[PDB]
């Protein structure tokens, strides 16, 4: 079983620890953990292409999209590999993450190790926001916190 | 040419940017960049097994040594995959890095993507320190700064 971890850090109070586990190479990836310092509501939760944090979360580049598809929700057929949808934060700003995804992987072509996980300012509209930006980034806004996905024990 | 990058950060003033470039899968990895906030002299420069920063640089675990060899200098036959020797800091605390290594890789069994690059407190004795610890870590001491090795543009 291959395991990975991501420590989310940003310029504000947004911080968190996200774990990934894939017991079979052709099976789903379990993604769990907790993020604090968020505003109440939904926040875009995406895997971005580069594990580059030289100039903050912006250097992570665009969404991880090796198949060059339109942006969508995680349950959609038309989605980027990095399209993990939204995380929901409670009144105290704590988002309890528990996601199972079959598009992302911890090995091969759709491998997310060495890439950046980003928690966004606003909700990801899941490609149904009614504008050009919605079909690319889902109008999720600024990058609150990010971290490079690394190999875990 | 596959590219990787690492942003070094710690609890102290040590901060740096390190680049990795491997033009051919079997070819050598060109590692270059700069590290500041360092005491003048030599500092251990090692790739550690885990890309885990949950408890700072300690969670990165031991040296990346998949072939279970003794610690040595980068020019030695007997060395860990992660044994990148020493970086040299000037009187102003700046360490200019320009290393070429044929043991580390950005693919295959020796892939360092998603692992942690660490700059240490003291000089790496390169296994020639004369004690049991020398053949394990090179007596490089504390972990000043670390970062997960991520995929770059």
Curated annotation (Swiss-Prot), chains A, B:
Covalent link (1-(tryptophan-3-yl)-tryptophan (Trp-Trp) (interchain with W-33)) residue numbers: 32
Location of N6-succinyllysine modifications: 3, 9, 91, 122, 136
Cofactors demanded by this protein: Cu cation; Zn(2+)
UniProt-reported outcome of changing residue 146 to A: Exhibits very slow copper acquisition
Result of altering residue 57 to S: Enhances formation of fibrillar aggregates in the absence of bound zinc
Annotated GO MF terms: copper ion binding; identical protein binding; protein homodimerization activity; protein phosphatase 2B binding; protein-folding chaperone binding; small GTPase binding; superoxide dismutase activity; zinc ion binding
UniProt: Zn(2+) binding residues: 63, 71, 80, 83
An example Gene Ontology biological process: relaxation of vascular associated smooth muscle
Effect of residue 80 to A: Loss of zinc binding and enhanced tendency to form aggregates
Impact noted for substituting residue 54 to R: In ALS1; reduces tendency to form fibrillar aggregates
Lipid addition sites, S-palmitoyl cysteine: 6
Chief localization: cytoplasm
Catalytic activity: 2 superoxide + 2 H(+) = H2O2 + O2
Outcome following mutation: residue 90 to A: In ALS1; does not seem to be linked with a decrease in activity
Effect of residue 80 to R: In ALS1; sporadic form; interferes with zinc binding
Disulphide-bonded residues: 57-146
Keywords from the UniProt entry: Acetylation, Amyotrophic lateral sclerosis, Antioxidant, Copper, Cytoplasm, Disease variant, Disulfide bond, Lipoprotein, Metal-binding, Neurodegeneration, Nucleus, Oxidoreductase, Palmitate, Phosphoprotein, Ubl conjugation, Zinc
Mutation effect (residue 146 to S): Enhances formation of fibrillar aggregates in the absence of bound zinc
PANTHER family per the UniProt record, alphabetical: SUPEROXIDE DISMUTASE CU-ZN -RELATED (PTHR10003)
Family the entry assigns: Belongs to the Cu-Zn superoxide dismutase family.
Disease affiliated with this protein: Amyotrophic lateral sclerosis 1: A neurodegenerative disorder affecting upper motor neurons in the brain and lower motor neurons in the brain stem and spinal cord, resulting in fatal paralysis. Sensory abnormalities are absent. The pathologic hallmarks of the disease include pallor of the corticospinal tract due to loss of motor neurons, presence of ubiquitin-positive inclusions within surviving motor neurons, and deposition of pathologic aggregates. The etiology of amyotrophic lateral sclerosis is likely to be multifactorial, involving both genetic and environmental factors. Spastic tetraplegia and axial hypotonia, progressive: An autosomal recessive, neurologic disorder characterized by loss of motor abilities in the first year of life, after which severe, progressive spastic tetraparesis develops. Affected individuals have severe axial hypotonia, hyperekplexia, hypertonia, and myokymia, reflecting upper motor neuron involvement. Cognitive development may be affected.
Note: The protein (both wild-type and ALS1 variants) has a tendency to form fibrillar aggregates in the absence of the intramolecular disulfide bond or of bound zinc ions. These aggregates may have cytotoxic effects. Zinc binding promotes dimerization and stabilizes the native form.
Name under which the protein is recorded: Superoxide dismutase [Cu-Zn]
Species, as recorded: Homo sapiens
Lineage of the species this protein comes from: Eukaryota, Metazoa, Chordata, Craniata, Vertebrata
């Amino acid at each position: 079983a291959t395991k990975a971890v991501c420590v989310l850090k940003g310029d504000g109070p947004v911080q968190g620890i996200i774990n990934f586990e894939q017991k079979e190479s052709n099976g789903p990836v379990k993604v769990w953990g907790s993020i604090k310092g968020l505003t109440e509501g939904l926040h875009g939760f995406h895997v971005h292409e580069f594990g580059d944090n030289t100039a903050g979360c912006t250097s992570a580049g665009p969404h991880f999209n090796p198949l060059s598809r339109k942006h969508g929700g995680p349950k959609d057929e038309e989605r980027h590999v990095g399209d993990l949808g939204n995380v929901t934060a409670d009144k105290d700003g704590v988002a309890d993450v528990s996601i199972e995804d079959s598009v992302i992987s911890l090995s091969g072509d759709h491998c997310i190790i060495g890439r950046t996980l980003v928690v966004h300012e606003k909700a990801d509209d899941l490609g149904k926001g009614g504008n050009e930006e919605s079909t690319k980034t889902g109008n999720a806004g600024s990058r609150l916190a990010c971290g490079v996905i690394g190999i875990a024990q």
